Ligand binder design. Structure first.
Ligand SMILES: NC(=O)c1ccc[n+]([C@@H]2O[C@H](COP(=O)([O-])OP(=O)(O)OC[C@H]3O[C@@H](n4cnc5c(N)ncnc54)[C@H](OP(=O)(O)O)[C@@H]3O)[C@@H](O)[C@H]2O)c1
Ligand SMILES: NC(=O)c1ccc[n+]([C@@H]2O[C@H](COP(=O)([O-])OP(=O)(O)OC[C@H]3O[C@@H](n4cnc5c(N)ncnc54)[C@H](OP(=O)(O)O)[C@@H]3O)[C@@H](O)[C@H]2O)c1
Ligand SMILES: NC(=O)c1ccc[n+]([C@@H]2O[C@H](COP(=O)([O-])OP(=O)(O)OC[C@H]3O[C@@H](n4cnc5c(N)ncnc54)[C@H](OP(=O)(O)O)[C@@H]3O)[C@@H](O)[C@H]2O)c1
Ligand SMILES: NC(=O)c1ccc[n+]([C@@H]2O[C@H](COP(=O)([O-])OP(=O)(O)OC[C@H]3O[C@@H](n4cnc5c(N)ncnc54)[C@H](OP(=O)(O)O)[C@@H]3O)[C@@H](O)[C@H]2O)c1
Ligand SMILES: CCCCCC(=O)CC(=O)SCCNC(=O)CCNC(=O)[C@@H](O)C(C)(C)COP(=O)(O)O
Ligand SMILES: CCCCCC(=O)CC(=O)SCCNC(=O)CCNC(=O)[C@@H](O)C(C)(C)COP(=O)(O)O
Lengths: 236, 73, 248, 248, 236, 73
């Protein structure tokens, strides 16, 4: 457990994987989790059935991370459900990995608009909602690639690295009302590459979730604009 | 005007006597920037609808907000 | 001067400012420069005429670097004209600075496609055309906000940081055939982007540069030249910083 | 609170300031803390008495962390007392700030052996004693000048940067047995190092922190706690930054 | 070739390897090189015999990089030989690589005092000599290890990383009289590790030398405090 | 004194009339820091030998450099 002065969190793309279990962890710490799905709701409902069976608070929502009006409408509906929003985890992510010579401009705009523009909308809405309350925390999930780069991921790396830089800029803008923006760059998360990780194992999603939790927490209070490398030593 | 006085003065810790219709917000009422944008956004919460950028670009005194709001009423 | 195995460079948005200086600098070092222009070609044309009256090889070309097909056909035309392209400088950049709460997504995409996406098209076509000669140097013009971040600069910062990360990835993709990609992070550089800016907000930056001065576009240009030259033949994927100490 | 598989931590130079807060913070989270003191033990002893009257496990210990043999014997004594040592925080730090032209090498070595060398001894003995249980977390207290650099701060900057690089190397050496090393780069932290400092030079920093405030030692302490806890079980060799935005 | 407003350079540990050929390159660009040796002079003389046979200007000097008085006396003697000093290349470097458990405090102080303290002396002397002239450039040779770290090099990595941080601080102090301080981090310089370098080859010493030359040059004029990664992509 | 006037005034672009024996270097003659250290170092170039830190620590006016130099003569 950790302190959380805030009350609820919204987690984009949280029906499965990492997203699902940031929801699962944050709810275990007493926060109301807003699990976002984009296509099916059988799995997102199953997640909050697991949650509420365990006595935590969960609630699902449908909206495309890429869409400004859908995301904005949503954030609005959560504000008037719960009387405001406290924390955001910009998690929605997709890849289309190709060599550059085999990659077109659409294979690039997809990953940009769908990995990066979503996070821009989210952080800007964060500024908007959390200003009166003078409090909040936002965490963008980035990658190790947004830092070192990878062969075959010219679009994914651009999207993440831009996310990190923008995120620093959002931290600048949100500090004036006591809002923290930070970034988490996971390494490889669950086998050739294991030899390259010093901890000699694939990171589990619960570790990335607990890192996000520390960042949203009040144990990160003077931490803004940082980029938290959760890679087991894969990049230093 | 009176209400506009009160709301702008609340919005950035300033006495109602400060707000004279040619009191600039930054040079006079002492405001940063985002605070002004938020003041504007606050004044659209009295439904002057989207007093557009063209007037955000043109606003600096507090007589400047009587204009563009009695216009967009 | 410096020492280049290559022959020709393409420099996007090189009609004025920083890009104009990179063009002059590489022209004076024996390279044949391909100045690029989006709209008014009068300024560009004047730059080429200056370079040619100095006895240098220069030539103007008009695409929108954000347009894929335009960029591809102009690089194809350059290959057909000079028998190949050696060096690329992705310089095209625009800024729209607004607070995030007043920023529409149009103002985000504007900066993303202009500053980031054009660089992507340039790097890919550079791979394509330099693959065959297995030789090449590309330099993307990022910014210090691509690294540090800044206020009212969410779109610009996103574009520049994406540029740096994607440039690293391109260094990996093209290293095997000796195609090197690198970046440059200028500090406060006294060109057109910065002229119209509050004087007491501008004197706030001279405080934080240890070199106590505004950087000139020629000083960015010469670092770009060094990264293109044969001297940096073992430097790929570096993000060389030219801010006079404003960031370290 | 947080969640620790370990039982005990050793925190060098924890009598007052930041180190005092890391000690309080870990004591309140169920860990048994070993406060360290170089000279006057009255302050340390008072800190332990405070922690124990709160119903916490604390104990004071006196080595000079720059002395190899002293450090080794005190860690050996801790192992003999508690049956092993789980966590380490290399916090001992001193500053001598002078211009480089007035700086003798005595003033360089002073800061090097105090701030850098003690951390090395701590990290090595942590490897030694945590190797057998194959579990452990160490956190070195670097600084923002370890990253950014500063004026009159050549010795301090050297020591902190060396700390970060050496801490990365220790992360490699100890990763295989699940011994994680990490670092912390605080910004302006309102403890004894900074109290006696020019007020108009000190208000020059509030300008450049976006959070608009001086950081408290407890806020550094809780980040140290998170890096020690079981939450960061996949984080080794990170240089986590806690400067309120002063550096990004 | 490149511009050099200055006149002479001093290069510590320049009898062989990298050092020898920074001397060899800088002299090829018209600068007077001061080749420093510490033990034998047969090789340092041979270097300047190669140089002056080729029509460049070279001159040898004997002084321990680790010694404050020896280094200070020297810099002084070069100032009154050549009427001043323009550029410095802090190059002297030694390693003693061991696992940490097999490494003592002396195996660490050797590398610190002998890789790091030397560079401190050099940069401080640089401040001292070059202040009146209001001009100069200093370049410290660091490493990739001073950046990412290596297993078995806990002392070498500390020395280099501290060198880089101090060097940034020297850049701060020297900017007030127009003196630039910068750093060069070479990768692996002349075979298991070749697979890890993207350029798929060991870097040659001439490349590190030409990087140092660019940094000392007037093509680096607004470049101070930077850390120039000459690693072929090994670390990004 | 006259020569000390001239050399300190040369050292940091200041008119000889500025240097009155209680003219502080930073608050009055307007100096940064390193410049002062260098002034001192310049005054040891008239061989006042190592006017020691204890006096560097105690120096701020220009009557302050008549002292410690007529002392260390
Ligand atoms: N797993 C790794 O190795 C790894 C490594 C580094 C970082 N990360 C990052 O960590 C985060 C989670 O990764 P992950 O493994 O969960 O990816 P994942 O396993 O594919 O799950 C990502 C989720 O994001 C969703 N998403 C994409 N665009 C969306 C949008 N516009 N609106 C809503 N949801 C959207 C996907 O939705 P759909 O179901 O519609 O696809 C999916 O639910 C991402 O930001 C990813 O980039 C992952
Ligand atoms: N000055 C600084 O402080 C600073 C520092 C960081 C980086 N830089 C970079 O410097 C570069 C330009 O330097 P500058 O600041 O001097 O800017 P500038 O004076 O505006 O020069 C920018 C040029 O790029 C052109 N351009 C923009 N988009 C283009 C496109 N899609 N295709 C072709 N040309 C295009 C311009 O547009 P028009 O046709 O509209 O004239 C203009 O000629 C940019 O990449 C910027 O990102 C600036
Ligand atoms: N405050 C900041 O802004 C800031 C930010 C960056 C990092 N930190 C780090 O904070 C740590 C201490 O925090 P502080 O700034 O609050 O300093 P402080 O108030 O001086 O606390 C430093 C403590 O470390 C002790 N110590 C020094 N050398 C030691 C040694 N060899 N063995 C044992 N104890 C030793 C002290 O010496 P005595 O016996 O002489 O009291 C003192 O108790 C340092 O590592 C510093 O490098 C400070
Ligand atoms: N080669 C690589 O793979 C590599 C990698 C990264 C960076 N570097 C760095 O690049 C620089 C040159 O490396 P290198 O390959 O030339 O090392 P090297 O081949 O061993 O040559 C280094 C030279 O430094 C000299 N030196 C050491 N301490 C000295 C002192 N106090 N005074 C004078 N000379 C001293 C050595 O002198 P002695 O003859 O007395 O030993 C030797 O002449 C060093 O800073 C090194 O750390 C090397
Ligand atoms: C500039 C240092 C080097 C930058 C180099 C670079 O690449 C940046 C540019 O292109 S110029 C880009 C212009 N540079 C700036 O710093 C503009 C920042 N101004 C703002 O963010 C304003 O919106 C703000 C003052 C916060 C609010 O408005 P209100 O007060 O009305
Ligand atoms: C401080 C920001 C966060 C730092 C955190 C940190 O770790 C630094 C410390 O420990 S306090 C270390 C004290 N911090 C400083 O900034 C002191 C710097 N002062 C100097 O360098 C002076 O020598 C100088 C003014 C240039 C010349 O003297 P003259 O004018 O007489």
């Amino acid at each position: 457990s950790m302190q959380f002065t805030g009350k609820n969190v919204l987690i984009t793309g949280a029906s499965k994987g990492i997203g699902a279990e940031i929801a699962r962890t944050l709810a275990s710490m007493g926060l109301k989790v807003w699990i976002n799905y984009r296509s099916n709701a059988e799995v997102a409902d199953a997640l909050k059935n697991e949650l509420e069976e365990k006595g935590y608070k969960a609630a699902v929502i449908k909206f495309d991370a890429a869409s400004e009006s859908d995301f904005v409408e949503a954030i609005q509906a959560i504000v008037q459900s719960d009387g405001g929003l406290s924390y955001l985890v910009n998690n929605a992510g997709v890849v289309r990995d190709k060599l550059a010579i085999k990659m077109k401009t659409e294979d690039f705009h997809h990953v940009i608009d769908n990995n990066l523009t979503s996070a821009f909308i989210g952080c800007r809405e964060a500024l908007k909602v959390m200003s009166k309350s003078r409090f909040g925390s936002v965490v963008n999930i980035a990658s190790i690639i947004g830092e070192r780069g990878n062969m075959g991921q010219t679009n994914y790396s651009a999207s993440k690295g831009g996310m990190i830089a923008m995120s620093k800029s959002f931290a600048y803008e949100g500090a004036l009302r006591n809002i923290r923006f930070n970034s988490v760059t996971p390494g490889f998360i669950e086998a050739d590459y294991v030899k390259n990780i010093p901890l000699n194992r694939l990171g589990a999603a619960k570790e990335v979730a607990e890192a996000v939790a520390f960042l949203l927490s009040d144990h990160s209070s003077y931490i803004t604009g940082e980029t938290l490398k959760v890679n087991g030593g894969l990049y230093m | 005007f009176e209400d506009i006085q009160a709301v702008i003065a609340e919005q950035l810790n300033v006495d109602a006597a400060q707000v004279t219709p040619e009191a600039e917000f930054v040079k006079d009422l002492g405001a940063d920037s985002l605070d002004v944008v938020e003041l504007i956004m606050a004044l659209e919460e009295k439904f002057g609808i989207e007093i557009p950028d063209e007037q955000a670009e043109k606003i600096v005194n507090v007589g400047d907000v009587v204009k563009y709001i009695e216009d967009n009423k």
